[PDB]
Amino acid sequence: DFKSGLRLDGDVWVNSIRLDEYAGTVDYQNKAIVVGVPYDYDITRMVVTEMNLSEGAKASIAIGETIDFSLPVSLTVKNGDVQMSYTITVKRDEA
Amino acid sequence: RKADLTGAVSVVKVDEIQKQGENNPVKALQGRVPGMNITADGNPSGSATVRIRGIGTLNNNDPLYIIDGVPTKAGMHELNGNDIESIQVLKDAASASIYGSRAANGVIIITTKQGKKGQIKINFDASVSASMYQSKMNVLNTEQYGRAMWQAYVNDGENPNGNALGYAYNWGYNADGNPVLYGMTLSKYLDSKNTMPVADTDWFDEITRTGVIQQYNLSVSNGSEKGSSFFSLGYYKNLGVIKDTDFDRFSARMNSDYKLIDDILTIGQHFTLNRTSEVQAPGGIIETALDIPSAIPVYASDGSWGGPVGGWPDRRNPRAVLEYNKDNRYTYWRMFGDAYVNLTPFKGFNLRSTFGLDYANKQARYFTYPYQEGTQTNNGKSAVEAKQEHWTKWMWNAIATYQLEVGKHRGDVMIGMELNREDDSHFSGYKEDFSILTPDYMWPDAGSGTAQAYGAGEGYSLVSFFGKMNYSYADRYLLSLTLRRDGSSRFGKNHRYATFPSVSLGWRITQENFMKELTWLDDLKLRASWGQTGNQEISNLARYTIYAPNYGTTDSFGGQSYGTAYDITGSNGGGVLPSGFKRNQIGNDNIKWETTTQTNVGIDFSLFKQSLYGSLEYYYKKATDILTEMAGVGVLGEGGSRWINSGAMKNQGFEFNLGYRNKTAFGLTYDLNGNISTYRNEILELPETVAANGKFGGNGVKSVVGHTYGAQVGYIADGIFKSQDEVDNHATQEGAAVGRIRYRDIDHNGVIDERDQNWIYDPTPSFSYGLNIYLEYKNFDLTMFWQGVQGVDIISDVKKKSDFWSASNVGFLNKGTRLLNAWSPTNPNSDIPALTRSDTNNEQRVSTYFVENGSFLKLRNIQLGYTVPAVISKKMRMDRLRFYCSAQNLLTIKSKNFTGEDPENPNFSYPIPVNITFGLNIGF
Amino acid sequence: GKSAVEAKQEHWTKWMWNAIATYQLEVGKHRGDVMIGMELNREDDSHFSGYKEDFSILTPDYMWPDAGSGTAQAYGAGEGYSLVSFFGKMNYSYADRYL
Amino acid sequence: FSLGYYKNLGVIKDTDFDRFSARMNSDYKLIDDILTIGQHFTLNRTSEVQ
Amino acid sequence: DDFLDRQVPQGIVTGDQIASPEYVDNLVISAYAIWATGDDINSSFSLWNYDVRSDDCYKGGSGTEDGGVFNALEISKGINTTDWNINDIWKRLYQCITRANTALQSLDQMDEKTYPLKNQRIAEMRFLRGHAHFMLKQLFKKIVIVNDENMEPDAYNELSNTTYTNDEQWQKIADDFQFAYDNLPEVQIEKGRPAQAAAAAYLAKTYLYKAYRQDGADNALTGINEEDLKQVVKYTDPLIMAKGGYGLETDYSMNFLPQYENGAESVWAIQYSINDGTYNGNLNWGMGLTTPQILGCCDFHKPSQNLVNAFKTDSQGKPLFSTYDNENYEVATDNVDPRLFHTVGMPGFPYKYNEGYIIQKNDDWSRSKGLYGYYVSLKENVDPDCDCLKKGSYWASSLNHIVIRYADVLLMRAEALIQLNDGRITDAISLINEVRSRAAGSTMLIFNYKEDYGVNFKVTPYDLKAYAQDEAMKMLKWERRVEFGMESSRFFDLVRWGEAKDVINAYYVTEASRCSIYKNAGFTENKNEYLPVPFEQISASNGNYTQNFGW
Ligand SMILES: OC[C@H]1O[C@@](CO)(OC[C@H]2O[C@@](CO)(OC[C@H]3O[C@@](CO)(OC[C@H]4O[C@@](CO[C@]5(CO)O[C@H](CO)[C@@H](O)[C@@H]5O)(OC[C@H]5O[C@@](CO)(OC[C@H]6O[C@](O)(CO)[C@@H](O)[C@@H]6O)[C@@H](O)[C@@H]5O)[C@@H](O)[C@@H]4O)[C@@H](O)[C@@H]3O)[C@@H](O)[C@@H]2O)[C@@H](O)[C@@H]1O
Ligand SMILES: OC[C@H]1O[C@@](CO)(OC[C@H]2O[C@@](CO)(OC[C@H]3O[C@@](CO)(OC[C@H]4O[C@](O)(CO)[C@@H](O)[C@@H]4O)[C@@H](O)[C@@H]3O)[C@@H](O)[C@@H]2O)[C@@H](O)[C@@H]1O
Ligand SMILES: [Mg+2]
Ligand SMILES: [Mg+2]
């Protein structure tokens, strides 16, 4: 009688992503996904290979598309009528 | 039998008082007495406020209850009401003066059940009821809240996506350029720590429940000329609609009397012991539930209580508040006894000496659990309060009465002396720094922190000498003369004693020979009375210049403790600071009794052989030298408050009681008791500082003198602006814009300011009426009591928090549902002002916008009962078996001008539930 | 020059509920009674005290914890216990001579 | 129904003991001999200086 | 028949007994303690609630509705004489006056030989009464001078606020400070009590305010009186301060750190204490609202970008007299006075010298969602970890509140000399250079900021040369503004100088861009430089109180 019917359940977690052949470590406290590359990888063309979020969760970034990751990339995961934002960054294993 | 028989006396019929099934008999007789106003919030306890003949004085207006001859002002909700035999309300000064020196506000005489002579009876009554919460305020859900905030932002012209509450709006414009909202989305977690998931929470449903009421009474009476006795047991329990609030009461009453010798030396007593345990709702719990937005979850991610985080408004979790308050239970023992001895040396003489005792003992233990609800916390503070209070009032009375029956002359004379002494005391301990944090562990010994001790005591005494003379000629002319000499300990020696006379006349016109032929007119009596009564209900330390050593140990909000303790050495404390004294009030040695003069004129009639009876009364009350606590002039500083005899109040009123009872050809016995009343109140004189600060009305803007008590002054709202042309054409005012409230220019100066105010509120109904219908047919009895009030205005704050966005002190609070239908260019047909985030127009000001028509008519009680036939009852050995199902507060009708709900309770006080009851009576 | 006040309060509340079923019989010269009973007792005691110091007038009327202007202490304790009992008593009498 | 008052001033000065007492017993026999309901109550108030 | 006489009042002292000789010290301590326990959150004796009208600070809180009357004061629009805050502050200050008067009335009836400190105690009570009268005179131009301790309560109704003219009222205020200066001891071992140096400084302040004449119905300046300035110079002499042993502290932050209470610069201060048997302690409840949102709530008293820009300095080492507010202060490319980091807590910097709390431009630090900016005042706040602080429904600290500072005394003397213009501008410039040198040296706790956040500190004194009177006055105004920011005297100084209208209008126009509350702001020439006399008080004293001009 009082519920707004806005389907607030909406799990929006991100399990893992794989850019090319490299996995990314996900931190939920600051919503960051860090991917390392061997300090010579071309970071301007990466195809998002696999990305498993949740059941019913859709992301702005699709699967199979190529992206320039020279700078951090914002990703929005939407489930139902809720959403969560993550920042994906790629670093060249600097020492 | 009206006892006095020559004054303003209303007899209340307990046989239908008991039908409402209420803990408080006073609350049961809510609308059944003309010239009486009963206000009850609806808490589990039957506590209610009584006002007889309107407001009569600028002090405590509570009437004086007299149970079995012992006066008391304590509420009746702590006394068993199912052992009441008769109730009489004495509203006239002449009639009620003889019953005490505290009769200025009216007297309620309650006579408990007594053993009927020559017979023994037993009654067992059981009742089980469910109370449901009906006046559920409609607050915005999550989607509605987001829509309202978006509307406010776009009306102000700011970017709604800057709300920073996790809302993301997809919105655009229509053809005309008016903003429209396509949709909204929310951030799942309200905080960056992912601890407070967003949720749609119904706070009122979460804090409310379905309460249960249980009532069991067992009385046994046994009477003979050899002596009589009566023993009653009673148990009442009520779970309030608000969770973790409840009230239960055990009661035991023991009355007896013995007649010795032959008729001399009659010794009687009435005693009663009551034990009431209660848990009350925290202050403003309804306010908190209304304020907190629906997006806040009840529970956090980890199971702890959910609360505001991030940019959300700071309001405590109401469910958590109730859960922490559930242990603040107090116990209260009430002990109302009296013993009287009556000596009858010969035929006409009587000497009655009565001793009364009223001992009350309250013991409570309040806890302060540490709470951390989001950003709301008390820094892990844990504390315990152990509070104890004692009240002891004893009265000793002596009466000498003589009667004479010479010829057609009947005359009685009574001389009495009465002494009253009341002593109150209380003390509390306070401890902190607990570890386990449970009521079992939380005791002051177990505490390991700072400790405080509070304590006070007070008392007063009254002495009275009274004389009452009644004369009757031919049972047709009646005359009464009473005189009182009263002194109180609250006055100086010079002004301690005061004298109050009262006279009453009555003429039974039907007894006159000239109207014998009018046989239809069964009875007609015309009575008049003029009396003076005294008032001294003030603070005990009224005439003294009080200096108190306020060290500052009492808790205070905001730090304005006015304590007396300064680190004069300059070492950030670390010990016991030097202390001193502060002035609480300035003494006044010239205070004397407040004099209330009442003139009453009544006509009682009965027609068609007691088939159509009634009364019509007109009264005029005038209170002078009202003992008022006038405030200081302002430069007089603290303690400038002082009591003074500088008041004057006037009350003119009309009362009309009617009742028609008759049978029917097919066997339907109908009884209708109608009642209607009205009154006008006015203040004639008042101290200058009181008129200036406006505690009695006027809001400190204009003097209330010459106006009704409690009348308020505010602006006048002439609708809302709907175009820039209207804004320009209206007189200039700060903050005027499209969709804002237009305030009338009273003085026609062309500018709206603080001088554009006028009387807008009058808290006096045009008239209040009640109607009781009783139908009997073939063992089935239906009772219906309706109560209506017409012509009353009410100041509403729910309207303030439902018709405005950002009108409270803090922003982004949850609002009422009707806020959605606010004025906008897309929605032109409206009167609610357009939403805005900034209160530039200052619409919080007192105005006619918040004045609502409080007229209402509600079915207070309905009850359907079936009585088992006498043959079956006798076969079962029961003298009377009865079942009934009843409803209280079932239905109401309100004026369309009332935006809110439940006009009887238009604010954030405790709600009034609907009670559905099933009960039985057995009369072995 | 020590001045102090103690405000001490104590409560004791004991309630007992008892139920008894008794039967008597007078067969001939035999007189026999049998009684079966159940009893519940519950006692709850509590007490608490406040203690204040540094008074000025030093009279019982003035000496109250609010009027005090010194160190304060608070004491408090509670306790209780419960008892349950089931008992049976049988009496027999022969010829009003043997019991 | 009983009322009682006792007061004692001890031989040692400023030590005393007083007591008010009120007792109320009753019983009622209903039907014919079934359902006998009785009660005994007493209220006492003792003030003492030791 | 003593039945009506047996019972007596419990736990109180009657008026007849309060006059006994042994309660005089108790009454004196009471008169002191009203200054620490008589102030509410919305009415603090620091007067920061009513100093929001100046350009230093905004009003904090959730929004404009949080204390709507104070928002009305801040924008100088829609102010009503029937506002609860005005009446409340009036009543509180007069309550302090009456407690002091009760102490004085008790003292005046005592044998001096039996009570040797009678004159000193009377001087202290007179000093407190004069302090309250001074605050009342600042807030409302026309006040009631209640300086007769032997006045019956019935006689108070006959008092009027127009018995004396403005100059006479200032003189009556200054008389109490004159008596206190004459009778107080040179040095007070007992820190709470005022000293002769404090009395002299506050008397000099009274004469300084008296000099700027407000003759006529309007509130406009009507010339500068030379005799009052001469008296100011006489009573601000450094010999008196040296005798009292007062002087500028080596660092600016010591005036506000809890570890250095009752320092050399603290001429007189309201003493706030913790752990003293009080329910929560005599904490500074007046500044309870000003705590940042990180401490939990109420986020009031936020400084202004105008104030930060004023703190910004030039390349040479002098304040930007004309172009300071053209652009917002840049941390990396602008030289800044070090006093900024003692006064205002900017984002990206430690809060109250705690590296564990870095101010951020998020909702965790601003309650109004950026409506009032993100700057946090630091002078009245303390480090959360110094256990100086307690949660008593409002986060309050035990930090003492300094009423008179030696920097204030020096700037007062400089103003007197400049206004006199009797060829002594060089001494005023010397005093200003001394204050600026102290400020420049005050970098003991902010030294690492240069290498941690790129902060450039550049403050230099002035050459001792002849300066024009207007130039010297401009420099003095700038020095006062940067020295006493957030200390709740900017508006009073603006009113005293007379340029309040112009400065406030310029501030409104400039800050309307960066704060939306100033869209409709407007300052009236002769109405808004003083709070109106409360309508309740005027009604109570019928035909005795006259409202200020313009209402
Ligand atoms: O007296 C005449 C006239 O004056 C009025 C006009 O509104 O008020 C002024 C009058 O009231 C005082 C109270 O001493 O001042 C109140 C004044 O304070 C303001 C602006 O200064 O805000 C102050 C802050 O107080 C807060 C604190 O929030 C909480 C809530 O308890 O306190 C602790 C602190 O951590 C936490 O629990 C909360 O953060 O709000 C308290 C304020 O809220 C009031 C105001 O009506 O009631 C609202 C709700 O607060 C509750 O506590 C909720 O649980 C409930 O009590 C109630 O439902 C009231 O309780 C408190 O005063 C914070 O929100 C504010 O920022 C303004 O809010 C307010 O105007 C006096 O100084 C002054 O004389 C009226 O009282 C009267 O008509
Ligand atoms: O302390 C002296 C003076 O205070 C009174 C009324 O001012 O009450 C003392 C305190 O008890 C309060 C608690 O807030 O009572 C409110 C609730 O407690 C009940 C107990 O059932 O009332 C106590 C008792 O007093 C009346 O309320 C009279 O006003 C009676 O109706 C009742 O018997 C309960 O009814 C309330 O919910 C509160 O009144 C005071 O703080 C007086 O009792 C006393 O003379
Ligand atoms: Mg007008
Ligand atoms: Mg201190």
Instruction: Spell out the domain ranges in chain E.
Output: 1-551
Tell me the CA end-to-end span of chain B in Å, nearest whole number. 29
Contact E192 B700 (CB under 8 A): no
- Report d(CA B427, CA C49) in Å as an integer: 9
CA dist E141 to E97, E133, E213, E547, Å? 17, 11, 12, 10
Tokens 């007083």 map to which residue?
D18
Nearest CB neighbour to B443, from listed C64, C71, C78: C78
What the block records as the tokens of B30 is: 């809510």
DSSP string covering E7-23, please?
Answer: ----S-EETTGGGSGGG
- Report d(CA B391, CA B334) in Å as an integer: 9
Nearest CB neighbour to B141, from listed A4, A10, A79: A4
Find, among B330, B316, B318, B334, the residue nearest to B246 by Cα. Answer: B330
Residue nearest to atom 42 of ligand 2 (CA): B74
Subunits touching D (CB < 8 Å, at least 3 pairs)? B
Phi then psi for B851, rounded to 5 degrees? Answer: -90, 120
- Report d(CA E395, CA B377) in Å as an integer: 11
Q: Where are the beta strands (DSSP E) in B550-611?
A: 582-585, 594-607
What the block records as the tokens of E299 is: 């986020």
- Report d(CA E91, CA B564) in Å as an integer: 18
Closest residue in chain B to residue D34, using alpha carbons only: B924
Each residue of E71-84: b (16+ CB within 10 Å) or e?
bbbbbbbbbbbbbe
- Report d(CA E414, CA E427) in Å as an integer: 7
Contact E314, E73 (CB under 8 A): no
- Report d(CA E500, CA B671) in Å as an integer: 79
Continuous H helices in B643-797: 688-693, 724-729
- Report d(CA E372, CA E346) in Å as an integer: 13
Considering Cα of A20, then A25, then A26, then A29, what sign does the dihedral take? negative
What contacts E489, CB < 8 A, 6 or more positions away?
E51
Torsion angle of alpha carbons B572, B576, B580, B583, nearest 10°?
Answer: 80
Each residue of E103-117: b (16+ CB within 10 Å) or e?
bbbbbeeeeeeeeee
Phi then psi for E254, rounded to 5 degrees? Answer: -65, -25
- Report d(CA E270, CA E46) in Å as an integer: 10
What contacts B31, CB < 8 A, 6 or more positions away?
B38, B675, B768, B769, B770, B785, B787, B860
Instruction: Please give the distance, rounded to the nearest whole angstrom, from the Cα atom of residue B807 to the centre of ligand 4.
Output: 39
- Report d(CA E455, CA E338) in Å as an integer: 9
What the block records as the tokens of B572 is: 């950030």
Q: Measured between CB atoms, does B142 come within 8 Å of chain A? A: yes
CA distance D47 to chain B (A): 14
Spacing of C-alpha A75 from chain mean position: 5
Instruction: Please give the distance, rounded to the nearest whole angstrom, from the Cα atom of residue B80 to the centre of ligand 2.
Output: 18
- Report d(CA B288, CA B814) in Å as an integer: 10
Was E43 annotated as part of a binding site? no
Phi then psi for E26, rounded to 5 degrees? Answer: -60, -45
Find, among B751, B918, B923, B905, the residue nearest to B136 by Cα. Answer: B905
CA dist B146 to B198, B372, B808, B828, Å? 13, 26, 18, 21
Mark whether D and C touch (3+ CB pairs within 8 Å). no
Nearest CB neighbour to B231, from listed D22, D35, D39: D39
Helix (H, G, I), strand (E, B) or coil at B674: strand
Contact E288 B559 (CB under 8 A): yes
Bridge partners, residue B651, by sequence: B621, B681
B566 DSSP 8-state letter: -
Contact B637, E98 (CB under 8 A): yes
What the block records as the tokens of E34 is: 């009203």
For ligand 1, whether the C-beta of E536 sits within 6 Å is no
What the block records as the tokens of B135 is: 């006046």
For residue E314, the number of C-alpha atoms closer than 13 Å in the C-beta half-sphere is 11
What the block records as the tokens of B155 is: 């009306």
Torsion angle of alpha carbons B60, B66, B69, B72, nearest 10°?
Answer: -50
Chain B positions in Cβ-Cβ contact with residue C54 (cut-off 8 Å) = 576, 579
Contact B629, B641 (CB under 8 A): yes
* E133-E138-E139 Cα angle (round to 5): 100
Q: Which atom of ligand 2 is nearest to the CA of B362?
A: 20
What the block records as the tokens of E434 is: 């001394």
Map E342-396 to HEC letters.
HHEECCCCECCCCCCCECCCCCCCCCCCCCCCCCEECCCCCCCCCCCEEECCCEE
What the block records as the tokens of E445 is: 């706790």
For residue B657, the number of C-alpha atoms closer than 13 Å in the C-beta half-sphere is 21
Was B445 annotated as part of a binding site? no
- Report d(CA E338, CA E440) in Å as an integer: 7
For ligand 1, whether the C-beta of E238 sits within 6 Å is no
* A24-A25-A29 Cα angle (round to 5): 135
Spacing of C-alpha C13 from chain mean position: 5
Map B380-412 to HEC letters.
CCCEEEEEEEEEEEEEEEEEEEEEECCCCEEEE
Contact B227, B236 (CB under 8 A): no
Task: State the angle between helix axes of E166-183 and E196-211 in degrees (0 to 180), rounded to the nearest 10.
Answer: 160
CA distance C79 to chain B (A): 10
What contacts E541, CB < 8 A, 6 or more positions away?
B633, B634, E157, E159, E160
Was E315 annotated as part of a binding site? no
Each residue of E181-205: b (16+ CB within 10 Å) or e?
bebbbeebeebbbbbbbbbbbbbbb
- Count the helix, strand and coil residues of chain A and give each as a percent rounded to the nearest 5: 0, 45, 55
What the block records as the tokens of E284 is: 């500074």
| β-strands B266-279, B246-259 pairing | antiparallel
The amino acid occupying position E180 is A
Helix (H) or strand (E) holding E232: helix E226-235
